[PDB]
Symmetry: C12
Subunit: 65 residues, 12 copies
Amino acid sequence: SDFVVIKAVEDGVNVIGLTRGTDTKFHHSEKLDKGEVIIAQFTEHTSAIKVRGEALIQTAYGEMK
Amino acid sequence: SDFVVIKAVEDGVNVIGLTRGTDTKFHHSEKLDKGEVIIAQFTEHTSAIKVRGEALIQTAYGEMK
Amino acid sequence: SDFVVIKAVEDGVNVIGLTRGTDTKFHHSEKLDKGEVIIAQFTEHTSAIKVRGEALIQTAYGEMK
Amino acid sequence: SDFVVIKAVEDGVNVIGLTRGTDTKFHHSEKLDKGEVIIAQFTEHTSAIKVRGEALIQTAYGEMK
Amino acid sequence: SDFVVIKAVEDGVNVIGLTRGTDTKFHHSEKLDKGEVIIAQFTEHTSAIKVRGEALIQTAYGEMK
Amino acid sequence: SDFVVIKAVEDGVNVIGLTRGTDTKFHHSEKLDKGEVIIAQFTEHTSAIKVRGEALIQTAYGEMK
Amino acid sequence: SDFVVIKAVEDGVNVIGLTRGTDTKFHHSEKLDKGEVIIAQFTEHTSAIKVRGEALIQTAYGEMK
Amino acid sequence: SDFVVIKAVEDGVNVIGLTRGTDTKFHHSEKLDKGEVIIAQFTEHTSAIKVRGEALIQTAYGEMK
Amino acid sequence: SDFVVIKAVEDGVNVIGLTRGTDTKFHHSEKLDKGEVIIAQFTEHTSAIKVRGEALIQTAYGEMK
Amino acid sequence: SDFVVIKAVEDGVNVIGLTRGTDTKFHHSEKLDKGEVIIAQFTEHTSAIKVRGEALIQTAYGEMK
Amino acid sequence: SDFVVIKAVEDGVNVIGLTRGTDTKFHHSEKLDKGEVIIAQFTEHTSAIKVRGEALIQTAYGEMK
Amino acid sequence: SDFVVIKAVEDGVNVIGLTRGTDTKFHHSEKLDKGEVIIAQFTEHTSAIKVRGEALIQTAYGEMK
Ligand SMILES: N[C@@H](Cc1c[nH]c2ccccc12)C(=O)O
Ligand SMILES: N[C@@H](Cc1c[nH]c2ccccc12)C(=O)O
Ligand SMILES: N[C@@H](Cc1c[nH]c2ccccc12)C(=O)O
Ligand SMILES: N[C@@H](Cc1c[nH]c2ccccc12)C(=O)O
Ligand SMILES: N[C@@H](Cc1c[nH]c2ccccc12)C(=O)O
Ligand SMILES: N[C@@H](Cc1c[nH]c2ccccc12)C(=O)O
Ligand SMILES: N[C@@H](Cc1c[nH]c2ccccc12)C(=O)O
Ligand SMILES: N[C@@H](Cc1c[nH]c2ccccc12)C(=O)O
Ligand SMILES: N[C@@H](Cc1c[nH]c2ccccc12)C(=O)O
Ligand SMILES: N[C@@H](Cc1c[nH]c2ccccc12)C(=O)O
Ligand SMILES: N[C@@H](Cc1c[nH]c2ccccc12)C(=O)O
Ligand SMILES: N[C@@H](Cc1c[nH]c2ccccc12)C(=O)O
Ligand SMILES: N[C@@H](Cc1c[nH]c2ccccc12)C(=O)O
Ligand SMILES: N[C@@H](Cc1c[nH]c2ccccc12)C(=O)O
Ligand SMILES: N[C@@H](Cc1c[nH]c2ccccc12)C(=O)O
Ligand SMILES: N[C@@H](Cc1c[nH]c2ccccc12)C(=O)O
Ligand SMILES: N[C@@H](Cc1c[nH]c2ccccc12)C(=O)O
Ligand SMILES: N[C@@H](Cc1c[nH]c2ccccc12)C(=O)O
Ligand SMILES: N[C@@H](Cc1c[nH]c2ccccc12)C(=O)O
Ligand SMILES: N[C@@H](Cc1c[nH]c2ccccc12)C(=O)O
Ligand SMILES: N[C@@H](Cc1c[nH]c2ccccc12)C(=O)O
Ligand SMILES: N[C@@H](Cc1c[nH]c2ccccc12)C(=O)O
Ligand SMILES: N[C@@H](Cc1c[nH]c2ccccc12)C(=O)O
Ligand SMILES: N[C@@H](Cc1c[nH]c2ccccc12)C(=O)O
């Protein structure tokens, strides 16, 4: 399954999972400080991912700075 | 499934999910402040995505600035 | 499934879904103001998409300007 | 499924769906004025598409000017 | 399924569908005037396509002028 | 399925289908005059194709001149 | 299924089908005179093809002169 | 399945597996000293991976430094 | 299935099929005179092919002169 | 399945298999002397691989020196 | 299935099949004199191939000289 | 299935198969003298391969000298 790579360029970046289904709610958040990385899949329960704060993002479609 | 990457260049960007099926309405709007990103899939419930406001958008077919 | 990316270059763009099946009718029209984007799939209900107004379009086959 | 992208270069372009099956009949027509686009799939009902008038056409096999 | 793109360079181009099966005959002829285009699939009923008249032809294997 | 594109460079080209199975016989011969094209699939019935006369041929493997 | 393209560079080229199975026998031959072409598949009954005489041969692996 | 390659550039890197499902918890943290590498898959149990500390990361989408 | 293309550069080339299964023996030898070609598949009965004599050989992995 | 190639540049490299499943522990350590190589798959039992010591590592995503 | 191409550069090359399964034994050795080629698949019975003597080898991963 | 190509650059190279499953044991070794090659698959029984001694190794991921 598809995934995203998220690296914090500054402290306090939040990576938020949004629920799959008829409803769209916050189900989990991970905080990244500068330099920390999360590699996160889309899953049965997560169909959208929100990132708050300055991050470097890589997906199958390229880089989002 | 396919997805889209949307980064807000200005405050107040709305990323809107439109319902899959015979009927079409907005089922969710995620508001992004400047710099925030959403990576969102097409899903059982979402078959079109509308973006209002100045955003950087990436899909399987490249970039839309 | 395949999808199309449509960006309005000027106010008053309409993105129209045509019904899949023996009958062909417009089932939904989405208005886009300048700068707004819709990323829309072909679906069980939609097998053709009509775009009226000045728009930038991307598909698997490239760009229409 | 495969699809075609058709943009009218002049007013009065007609995009015509032809029936799949033993018989080949016109089952629907869409008119495009200058700059208007249709993105249309081949489907259960449609196995050939006819275009009358000056149009820019894109398919999986390239551009037909 | 595979398809062919045929554009008439002169009036009176005929695009002819030949029947799939043990027997081979012409089940349909679509006449194209100059500039008109047909995008036609191979199908349950059509396993060969004949073009008479001056036409620009595109397939999966490139162009035929 | 795989197909062949055949264009007659002179009058009197014949495109001949050979029967699939234990037995091999000509089941159909299509005459092509100069400039005429046939796009023909391999099928349940046809597992080899013979071309007589001066023709331009395209397949998945390239061009024969 | 895979196929081969065979063009006679001289008169009297023979293209011979060999049987699939425990036994390897000649089951059919086609004669090509100069310029004539056969496009022939491997099939349920043919698992090897022999060519006698000067021919230009194209397969998925390239050209054999 | 998809995997990640993580190399510690300094001592004290932690590679953390997050649980797949409705709940998201850290189920394992692997410490890496300078120069040590982990190559870790996404799995039935693990649907996101967090990396803390200065690390070189490679995925299908390229490198993070 | 995969195949090999073998052209005799000299008279007396032998193309030998070796049996698939626990036991290995030659089940067929096809003798090629200069210029003759065999295009031969791997099959239910043939899992290795031996060529004796000077031949030009092409496979999925390129040429062997 | 995916695999990794690991070559020891110094004596005492350990290649460690981590268990697939809810629990994570080290089920095997292969010690490599200088120049020795292990080519190791991900498997039913191994879903992460840890390398301690100076090694040259290759995976589907390139080299890690 | 995958295969290997082996050409003897000097007399006395041996191509040896090793048995698939819990046990590993030589089940067949084919001698190749200078210039002779074997194209051999991996099979139900053969899961490793040993080549002794000076040989040119081609596989999906390239050439060994 | 995936395979590896191993050529001995010096005498006395040992290629060792390690068992698939909960246990990781050596089940077979092949010795290669200078210039000798083994092409070995991963299999039901073998999920890791160890090489002792100076060898040239090729896999799907490139060359390991
Ligand atoms: N338990 C979550 C873990 C997860 C995966 N991707 C995420 C993105 C954001 C937050 C959490 C996650 C899930 O399986 O869906
Ligand atoms: N619950 C929504 C979440 C979602 C996915 N993609 C979206 C695009 C826009 C808005 C919401 C979404 C869904 O599963 O469909
Ligand atoms: N990328 C996957 C995510 C996924 C995993 N399991 C799922 C089950 C149902 C729907 C989606 C999923 C998909 O869109 O398919
Ligand atoms: N409810 C519509 C939403 C949609 C998808 N693509 C579209 C294109 C145009 C208009 C509406 C749509 C559907 O699932 O089919
Ligand atoms: N791209 C997928 C989206 C999707 C995921 N799960 C679905 C379930 C039903 C319909 C569509 C979906 C599709 O068109 O199929
Ligand atoms: N491009 C898809 C559209 C689609 C999604 N779900 C469907 C269900 C039925 C028919 C078509 C669809 C297709 O042609 O298959
Ligand atoms: N109802 C038509 C819609 C359509 C798709 N492609 C077309 C091309 C031309 C005209 C109509 C169409 C169908 O499903 O087949
Ligand atoms: N009814 C025809 C339509 C058609 C498709 N391709 C064609 C080519 C030529 C003529 C007609 C056709 C069919 O389904 O087969
Ligand atoms: N390109 C598709 C067109 C198609 C869509 N839905 C279909 C249903 C039946 C037959 C054909 C189709 C095909 O020929 O396969
Ligand atoms: N009825 C023939 C039509 C055909 C397809 N390819 C051909 C090539 C040559 C001659 C006839 C054909 C068939 O289905 O097989
Ligand atoms: N290219 C397709 C054409 C096709 C569509 N629907 C079919 C139904 C039966 C036979 C052929 C077809 C094929 O050879 O299969
Ligand atoms: N190229 C196809 C031709 C084909 C279409 N339908 C078939 C049915 C049976 C045998 C062959 C066919 C094949 O070799 O398979
Ligand atoms: N009836 C033969 C036709 C054929 C296909 N490929 C060939 C090559 C050589 C000779 C005959 C053939 C068959 O189906 O097998
Ligand atoms: N009857 C043999 C024909 C054959 C195919 N490939 C070969 C290679 C060598 C010799 C004979 C063959 C078979 O089906 O297997
Ligand atoms: N990348 C795989 C991970 C995986 C392996 N086995 C699984 C079983 C269930 C769910 C996920 C998995 C996936 O998303 O599918
Ligand atoms: N190239 C095909 C030829 C083929 C068609 N039908 C077959 C039936 C059995 C064996 C082979 C075939 C193959 O090797 O599979
Ligand atoms: N009977 C052997 C033939 C064979 C295939 N590849 C080989 C490599 C070496 C020796 C023999 C073979 C088998 O089917 O497995
Ligand atoms: N390349 C095919 C050869 C093959 C065709 N038909 C077969 C039947 C049984 C075994 C092998 C075959 C394979 O290894 O599978
Ligand atoms: N037992 C864990 C091992 C694992 C795989 N990938 C990981 C990433 C981080 C931490 C642990 C792991 C699992 O199968 O899921
Ligand atoms: N890469 C494979 C590893 C694997 C092999 N056999 C397995 C059995 C069960 C689970 C995983 C595996 C996978 O994730 O699927
Ligand atoms: N490369 C093939 C070899 C093979 C052919 N037939 C087989 C039957 C059983 C096991 C292996 C095979 C594989 O690993 O699958
Ligand atoms: N009998 C062993 C043969 C083998 C394949 N690859 C190997 C690598 C090393 C040693 C032995 C092997 C097996 O099937 O697994
Ligand atoms: N018995 C182990 C062998 C193994 C494969 N990959 C490994 C990586 C590290 C250590 C051991 C292994 C297994 O099948 O999983
Ligand atoms: N690369 C193969 C190895 C393999 C061959 N045969 C197998 C049987 C069972 C498990 C693994 C295999 C895989 O992991 O899929």
